[PDB]
Symmetry: C11
Subunit: 71 residues, 11 copies
């Protein structure tokens, strides 16, 4: 429960924050839908070892700021 985390702010409606399964197999286990202006703060966990952001978002990680772009 001490893992890194990412901060995602949706810059439009319908931004998808997608968790990919930890392990030998890689698939999406969850998509969190964010509407404009909502903020999600999400850890890497026993179940999530990779995170995909789809749509326009402002993203902060330990390595700095990055922005996803929609459509």
């Amino acid at each position: 429960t001490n893992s890194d985390f990412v901060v995602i702010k949706a810059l439009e409606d319908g931004v998808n924050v997608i968790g990919l399964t930890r392990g030998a197999d890689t698939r999406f286990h969850h998509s969190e839908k964010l509407d404009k202006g909502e903020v999600l703060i999400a850890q890497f966990t026993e179940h999530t070892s990779a995170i995909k952001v789809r749509g326009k978002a402002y993203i902060q990680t330990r390595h700095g700021v990055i922005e996803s772009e929609g459509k």
Copy 2:
């Protein structure tokens, strides 16, 4: 007990800090409502591995400041 935490200051009444379940499943287990000017300082835990904020709020984490908008 040592884990990261988030600071959320409500900038309007009814800000909703939403704790999502750690584990194979993902659903909210708790929603803490804040009135304007109230501050919540909240850890990631055995039970919460993601936090969502709805409503207008000033948020600080280890990565800096971010603001949610309602």
Copy 3:
């Protein structure tokens, strides 16, 4: 017992620092009342995984200064 802590200085009477329970269940277990000018320094612990401040206060955490407003 080296987890993080928050410093709260009441800027008016009747400030409440509230501890939220760690675990599957989330409820308030203690509200500490601070009057004007008193300072509480409070850890995250086995029993407290989130802290709510109600009323006007100057707060310090590892992420910097925030102020709760009455």
Copy 4:
């Protein structure tokens, strides 16, 4: 025996540094009274997970300086 500590310097007589119990219960377990100019350097411990300061004092923690103020 590795915890954070607080430094408290009394700026008037009768400063109370109060230890609150670690655990499911929260209660006062000790009040240390300081005369003006005395310095207490106090850790968080197995028994103390929250500290209250009453009266005028100069306080240092890892988060910087704060001052308590008296009635």
Copy 5:
């Protein structure tokens, strides 16, 4: 679990982020296709000890920024 991670932002369609198997044997176990403007934040794990990026992408690691070329 507390591992390092890599941030990849596709600057064109069809970018591939490829995980290479941890262990005595080295082969591809997964490729994640990213379209333009999508962001992947991927850890090293029990199963992935090297990551290859093919196509035009903006990459952030602990060592700074690097860019792959299409």
Copy 6:
């Protein structure tokens, strides 16, 4: 044996550096008397979880410099 320590330099004769007992009970277990110009470097330990300085002294900790007054 890796706990924090405090540096106390007595600025007058008769300075007392007092160790308070770790545990459920809080009481003075030792008072080290310092004369003008002597330096005591003292750890927090299994037996000492709080230190009180009485008398005029220049004090250094991890949080910086502070001075006790006569």
Copy 7:
């Protein structure tokens, strides 16, 4: 799964990133070919305790930037 990693960007076709075996024995166990513009981010592991880069590449480690030169 905590080790350091190396970032390799190929500046020409046919760059080889080569892993040397951990243990009493030292030999190449894998050579990953990178074409121009591809980026490999590769950890030290239970099986790799040394990494050789051959060909023209831009390399980042904790210690800073370095460039391999081909031919």
Copy 8:
């Protein structure tokens, strides 16, 4: 055996570095005399949880420089 240490440089003959016992009891267990210009680098240990310097000395610790003054 990775604890803090203090550096003590005698600025006159007869500087006395005094090690105080770890434990419920507190008394000195060792006194190490230094002549002018001699340097002692001394750790906190299983047996020493506090160190007292008598006499004129230049002292460095993690918290910076401090000087003891003689009598």
Copy 9:
């Protein structure tokens, strides 16, 4: 498996990076030959507790840059 590492870049042909055995005995167990412009990133390990560089090379460690000379 997270020890320190050295970065060696050969500035001429025939540079040798030589691993010395960990343990009570000290002998060379491997010499890696680097030709001009090749880079070797080599850890200290269970088997290697000292590394010797013979020949002209640019070297980076945690303590900074050093150059061996042929």
Copy 10:
């Protein structure tokens, strides 16, 4: 095998670097003589919990530079 270390450079012949025993008992167990210009890099260990330098020497520790004088 991971402790702090001290660097000592002899500025004259006959510099002594003396190890004091770790434990309840304190005594010199080794004295390493350094001639002018020689450098000794010496850890704290299971057997050495204090180090004395006698003679003119340039010394480096984590806390910076200090000089012993003959």
Copy 11:
């Protein structure tokens, strides 16, 4: 296997890097001869708790640079 290491570059022929035994006993167990311009990167280990450099050499440690004079 993550002790500190020292970097030694010989500035003349015949530089000796001597390892001193860890333990209650202190003696030289190995001396590594370095010719001019050769570089040795040597760790502190289970068997080596002090390192002596004889001859003219440029040295880097975590505490910065020092030169032995030969």
